[PDB]
Design a protein around this ligand. Structure first.
Ligand SMILES: [Cl-]
Ligand SMILES: [Cl-]
Ligand SMILES: [Mg+2]
Ligand code: NA
Ligand code: NA
Ligand code: NA
Ligand code: NA
Length: 326
DNA sequence: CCGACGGCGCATCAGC
DNA sequence: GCTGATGCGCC
DNA sequence: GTCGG
């Protein structure tokens, strides 16, 4: 990657603002700048060159000049040395432990993997499973395994009810050669924006995937969103595959295109696209796109018959999934 | 300057 | 119990 | 931290 050094720096700064400073807008600012620099097709020669990009301002330009001059950032060098900042950053790598919980644990003298392991009773359920699979969850998933996972999910879903449609979204749908997890959008004709003609639609699917030992653990579960753990089966004599995070989202069927736009991401692409929507006078969520009235109040859902329709509303040329990895 | 910055599901908790 | 705030997660 | 009015 042309500007990998700079983008890593900015990502590290973002993480610090989120995890330690608890400054979500600074976090988003750094990530937006990292993303715009990541897609910039030249090797950046100066902060001023970078500043020409949307999302890079005066402060980041200065840091980019320092980084180009020396290969590092004193601000980060110092952060890397702060024990409290270090501990907090580490703890937040456990799924279910955020900035608040991490600072709280550190207060109690819980700040290593070893500490966490002996204090399981101090963890909620989500955290306990995040700890259980700490190592596994930091591994990426080769697209080849994603394909095997897709096959299992789609086929098990079909076995429950042939009218279910399951679509793998996330980085997979954007064509990534590896993914951090598996994202599954689910629809069923019994669940629309107008009616829920069937209960347990998500449950039945989760239950079936548990029955075949694909889903192994649950982080959280409700009527429309499942957040859990899954695992590919391994052959005789061979090492097991790592455990993987899986997210399943049941979306009203008539709202599939807004749903699939959302779940395809990336996260930054979504933020960017939704902010542009706001500027164009619309608001987009995973269900609908709606006009903003004069007062600045969301109007009624606009008709959408394709992903492209959404892009049209906000006056963007269509972008294929593979070009949304921001 | 300075308000806005994407939008929302599930878990947990305070207050009634 | 409920509702509203907040934490944490997803893209 | 950056943007736009
Ligand atoms: Cl902030
Ligand atoms: Cl809506
Ligand atoms: Mg994903
Ligand atoms: Na800029
Ligand atoms: Na975490
Ligand atoms: Na996910
Ligand atoms: Na803005």
């Amino acid at each position: 990657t042309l500007n990998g050094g700079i983008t890593d720096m900015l990502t590290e700064l973002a993480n610090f603002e989120k995890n330690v400073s608890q400054a979500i807008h600074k976090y988003n600012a750094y990530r937006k700048a990292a993303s715009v620099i990541a897609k910039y097709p030249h090797k950046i020669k100066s902060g001023a060159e970078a500043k020409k990009l949307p999302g890079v301002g005066t402060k980041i330009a200065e840091k980019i000049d320092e980084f180009l001059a020396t290969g590092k950032l004193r601000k980060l060098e110092k952060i890397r040395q702060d024990d409290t900042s270090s501990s907090i950053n580490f703890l937040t790598r456990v799924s279910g432990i955020g900035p608040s919980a991490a600072r709280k644990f550190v207060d109690e003298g819980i700040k290593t993997l070893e500490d966490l392991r002996k204090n399981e009773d101090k963890l909620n359920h989500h955290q306990r499973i995040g700890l259980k699979y700490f190592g596994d969850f930091e591994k990426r998933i080769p697209r080849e395994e994603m394909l095997q996972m897709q096959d299992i999910v789609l086929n098990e879903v079909k076995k429950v009810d042939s009218e279910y449609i399951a679509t793998v979204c996330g980085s997979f749908r954007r064509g990534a050669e590896s993914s951090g997890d598996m994202d599954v959008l689910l629809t069923h004709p019994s669940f629309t924006s107008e009616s829920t003609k069937q209960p347990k639609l998500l449950h039945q699917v989760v239950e079936q995937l548990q029955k075949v030992h694909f889903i192994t653990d649950t982080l959280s579960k409700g009527e429309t969103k499942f957040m859990g753990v899954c695992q590919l089966p391994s052959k005789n004599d061979e090492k097991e595959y790592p455990h993987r995070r899986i997210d399943i989202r049941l979306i009203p069927k008539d709202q599939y295109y807004c749903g699939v736009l959302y779940f395809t991401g990336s996260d930054i692409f979504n933020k960017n696209m939704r902010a542009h929507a706001l500027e164009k006078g619309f608001t987009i969520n995973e269900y609908t796109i709606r006009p903003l009235g004069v007062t600045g109040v969301a109007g009624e859902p606009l008709p959408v018959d394709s992903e492209k329709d959404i892009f049209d509303y906000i006056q963007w040329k269509y972008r294929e999934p593979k070009d949304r990895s921001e």
